[PDB]
Amino acid sequence: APAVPDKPVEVKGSQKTVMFPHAPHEKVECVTCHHLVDGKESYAKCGSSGCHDDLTAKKGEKSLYYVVHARGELKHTSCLACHSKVVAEKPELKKDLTGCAKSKCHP
Ligand code: HEC
Ligand code: HEC
Ligand code: HEC
Ligand code: HEC
């Protein structure tokens, strides 16, 4: 298992880059995000070739946008899906964690 990044890392889309901080996610199993692929574990970039490499489409399993923003019902938890659950318990974090603008992801 490679070391978890100790500084925010870039999550590049086609037009915007969002910084991802691992620290606040220390109590989330690595596997929740870096899910198994072909039964084997992987820590490759979500947008890697052969993964979620469609950086422009809004929907589809190949879309990086969808796996990040789908508000739920997927095979794995998206950023927005989990954030909505967190925000339900800690409402003061609504804009910070789910906002489309002026949020922690999109300042
Ligand atoms: C409100 C629900 C939001 C809207 C609408 C958008 N976001 Fe995001 N977002 C996040 C990441 C990690 C990325 C990069 C990976 C990717 O999606 O490709 C993005 C990117 C965008 C983009 C640009 C897509 C592109 O450049 O190809 C748009 C137009 C966009 N987002 C709309 C992360 C998050 C996040 C963190 C948990 C939140 C709260 C939001 N995004 C919220 C919205
Ligand atoms: C979801 C909330 C995550 C948890 C929990 C962990 N990581 Fe992560 N990691 C995540 C993202 C969105 C990214 C960037 C992906 C991209 O497309 O850029 C990362 C990045 C890494 C990397 C480096 C390579 C990279 O993609 O930039 C490593 C080595 C990594 N993550 C390791 C790691 C470990 C070991 C975790 C558990 C202790 C772990 N991550 C949890 C999302 C999430
Ligand atoms: C390529 C080797 C991949 C990497 C690295 C990551 N994902 Fe992935 N993801 C991949 C496949 C082939 C599949 C479908 C089969 C499965 O294991 O579920 C997925 C699926 C997801 C989903 C669900 C999408 C759906 O259509 O329901 C999510 C939410 C997801 N993947 C997220 C994700 C993130 C955020 C990653 C980086 C940290 C990541 N995946 C890496 C293949 C690959
Ligand atoms: C739940 C299983 C999570 C997943 C998947 C993702 N995030 Fe998250 N995020 C989660 C928690 C528990 C928290 C902490 C909230 C708190 O109580 O303080 C967060 C925090 C962040 C932050 C805010 C960090 C800060 O400014 O201090 C960001 C920017 C963030 N999360 C981004 C993010 C992205 C891009 C994700 C998808 C790859 C993602 N989170 C998934 C829980 C969970």
Side-chain angles (χ1 to χ4, degrees):
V4 65
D6 61 355
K7 302 197 175 313
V9 301
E10 313 160 295
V11 183
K12 291 182 167 194
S14 72
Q15 287 168 154
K16 305 179 174 180
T17 302
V18 165
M19 299 310 281
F20 174 83
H22 274 87
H25 300 86
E26 291 174 27
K27 294 85 171 180
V28 178
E29 292 180 356
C30 303
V31 78
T32 300
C33 307
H34 301 292
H35 62 80
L36 304 185
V37 179
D38 291 348
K40 294 170 292 177
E41 63 173 22
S42 173
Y43 290 92
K45 298 182 182 172
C46 313
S48 288
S49 307
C51 303
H52 310 292
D53 57 15
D54 185 334
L55 310 204
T56 54
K58 252 43 172 171
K59 292 152 186 278
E61 176 272 353
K62 241 54 184 189
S63 160
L64 186 56
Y65 183 98
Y66 189 71
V67 295
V68 165
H69 307 86
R71 200 207 181 159
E73 310 184 42
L74 293 190
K75 312 176 150 206
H76 300 295
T77 310
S78 70
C79 312
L80 276 279
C82 178
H83 281 195
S84 293
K85 299 170 182 163
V86 169
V87 164
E89 307 174 348
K90 300 187 61 173
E92 71 280 6
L93 298 167
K94 181 174 167 49
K95 194 167 58 33
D96 280 1
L97 305 187
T98 60
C100 301
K102 281 170 166 181
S103 65
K104 288 301 188 191
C105 307
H106 298 302

